[PDB]
Amino acid sequence: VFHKIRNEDLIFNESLGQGTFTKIFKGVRREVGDYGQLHETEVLLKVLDKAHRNYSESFFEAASMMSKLSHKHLVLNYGVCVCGDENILVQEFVKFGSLDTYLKKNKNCINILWKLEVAKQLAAAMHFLEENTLIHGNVCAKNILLIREEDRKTGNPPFIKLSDPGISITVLPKDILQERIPWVPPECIENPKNLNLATDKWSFGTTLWEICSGGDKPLSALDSQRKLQFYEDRHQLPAPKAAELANLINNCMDYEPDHRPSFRAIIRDLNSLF
Ligand SMILES: CCN(CC)C(=O)c1ccc(Nc2nc(OCC3CCCCC3)c3[nH]cnc3n2)cc1
């Protein structure tokens, strides 16, 4: 399972935000690194809400999935803190934060080549998970972290990482799942038992829409019931202004789960634009 980190070696600093039933903090970890050298390491601290301790099993399982695998595009888990009654995950601190905020604030300063490079990296991470038959379950721009910005001294591309999915949608309350439309696929709204590898293909299409839409949230103007009726009438998301990926978005967001393309095919589609 996880590595145990003493709270004496952990300092909680600024709050970065809130997840689903969690609070997110920037922290510092005091550790012995390679060659016995003492290090002061920036860490991300995810604390499960005390009013939602019942989700602790799903809270830690979501991080345990990512730790059992090793890949350059997956966020590293350092371990779990020992505070007695608290549930605290200690993860690597990515310096440029989540993709969805980065897309908003750098709206004008992002062309199609930047978005394609990030899309290819996300597709590579999802292909890696698909080859391991591992279901993420919460693919969204919020859960994409920017390790490195694009460098214009070289043209060096940005580098992204995919974080853990958090508390699974199989146990989340109904109202939370419907707030997550259109990231949650239609078959999961009908029955969260339908969580499948095909789920991540749908959510990837929604995340691709986010990347092309400069940080806009799809269907944000619709309330929950209107989000449900969006699936009932089986509508598709509007084509983004930068519409080079609109066909891939709709292909991924197929209402028939069996027809959504494999990430091998998605990558091939992505690579057809250079
Ligand atoms: C000045 C403005 N910036 C951007 C430059 C920052 O403050 C900032 C924020 C976050 C990181 N880093 C980060 N963020 C995560 O989650 C993303 C956050 C989760 C909950 C709230 C929303 C974002 C992470 N998960 C696992 N390792 C993570 N590392 C770096 C910088």
From Swiss-Prot:
Ubiquitously expressed throughout most tissues. It is found in: Endomembrane system; Cytoplasm; Nucleus. Residues 10-274 form the Protein kinase domain. The record marks D175, I176 as: Breakpoint for translocation to form PCM1-JAK2 fusion protein. The modification Phosphotyrosine is found at Y35. It comes from the Eukaryota. Autophosphorylated, leading to regulate its activity. Also phosphorylated by TEC. Phosphorylated on tyrosine residues in response to interferon gamma signaling. Phosphorylated on tyrosine residues in response to a signaling cascade that is activated by increased cellular retinol. Non-receptor tyrosine kinase involved in various processes such as cell growth, development, differentiation or histone modifications. Mediates essential signaling events in both innate and adaptive immunity. In the cytoplasm, plays a pivotal role in signal transduction via its association with type I receptors such as growth hormone (GHR), prolactin (PRLR), leptin (LEPR), erythropoietin (EPOR), thrombopoietin receptor (MPL/TPOR); or type II receptors including IFN-alpha, IFN-beta, IFN-gamma and multiple interleukins. It is linked to Chromosomal aberrations involving JAK2 are found in both chronic and acute forms of eosinophilic, lymphoblastic and myeloid leukemia. Translocation t(8;9)(p22;p24) with PCM1 links the protein kinase domain of JAK2 to the major portion of PCM1. Translocation t(9;12)(p24;p13) with ETV6. Interacts with EPOR, LYN, SIRPA, SH2B1 and TEC. Interacts with IL23R. Interacts with SKB1. Interacts with STAM2. Interacts with IFNGR2 (via intracellular domain). Interacts with LEPR (Isoform B). Interacts with HSP90AB1; promotes functional activation in a heat shock-dependent manner. Interacts with STRA6. Interacts with RHEX; this interaction occurs in a erythropoietin (EPO)-dependent manner. Interacts with ASB2; the interaction targets JAK2 for Notch-induced proteasomal degradation. Interacts with MPL/TPOR. Belongs to the protein kinase superfamily. Tyr protein kinase family. JAK subfamily. Possesses 2 protein kinase domains. The second one probably contains the catalytic domain, while the presence of slight differences suggest a different role for protein kinase 1. This is Tyrosine-protein kinase JAK2. It comes from Homo sapiens. The chain holds residues 536 to 809 of 1132 of the full protein.
